[PDB]
Amino acid sequence: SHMCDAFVGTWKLVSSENFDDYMKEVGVGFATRKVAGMAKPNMIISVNGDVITIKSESTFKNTEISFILGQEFDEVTADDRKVKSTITLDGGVLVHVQKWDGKSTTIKRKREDDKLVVECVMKGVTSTRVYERA
Numbered sequence: 861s862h863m864c865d866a867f868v869g870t871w872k873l874v875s876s877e878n879f880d881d882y883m884k885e886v887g888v889g890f891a892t893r894k895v896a897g898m899a900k901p902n903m904i905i906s907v908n909g910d911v912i913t914i915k916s917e918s919t920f921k922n923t924e925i926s927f928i929l930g931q932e933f934d935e936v937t938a939d940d941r942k943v944k945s946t947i948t949l950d951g952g953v954l955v956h957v958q959k960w961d962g963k964s965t966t967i968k969r970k971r972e973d974d975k976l977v978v979e980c981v982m983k984g985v986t987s988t989r990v991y992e993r994a
C-alpha cells in the first residue's frame with residue numbers, strides 16, 4: 861500500500877462553486893467558459909509504481925496526465941493551455957502548480973470523508989469542485 865492509495869479510483873463531479881470566476885481569472889474566454897462550466901467530469905486516478913495517472917473525461921474534453929511526484933512535466937489543460945506542471949504531496953494533499961505565460965495557478969486535491977475535494981486557486985480566486993466515487 862502506498863502513497864496515494866486513498867485517491868485511486870473513479871470519481872464523478874457532484875458540486876462546483878465559483879468555477880466561472882476561477883476560469884475568468886485564468887484567462888478562459890466566454891465560449892469556453894460556458895461550455896466547460898456545464899461539464900460533469902469523471903476523474904480516474906491510478907498509480908503504477910512511482911507513476912500517478914489522472915484522467916479527466918467529460919463531454920467538454922478528455923485530458924490525461926501521468927507524472928512522478930516532484931518532477932516537472934508538460935500538460936495540456938482542458939482549456940487548451942500548454943503549461944509546465946509540478947505535483948507534490950504535502951501532508952497528504954496533492955499540490956499541482958501550473959506555470960505558463962508568466963502566470964501560475966495551484967490545484968489542490970484531498971480526501972475528505974468519502975469525497976475528493978479539488979480546490980483551484982488563481983490569485984485571490986478559489987473554486988471548489990467536489991467529487992464522489994462513481
Ligand SMILES: O=C1C=C(O)C[C@@H](C=C2c3ccccc3-c3ccccc32)O1
Pocket residue numbers: 873883886888896897899901903916918920937938939967978989
Ligand atoms: O482536477 C481537476 C478537477 C476539476 O473539476 C477541474 C479541473 C480543471 C479544469 C480547468 C482548469 C482551468 C480552466 C478550465 C478547466 C476545466 C474545464 C473543464 C473540466 C475541468 C477543468 O481540475
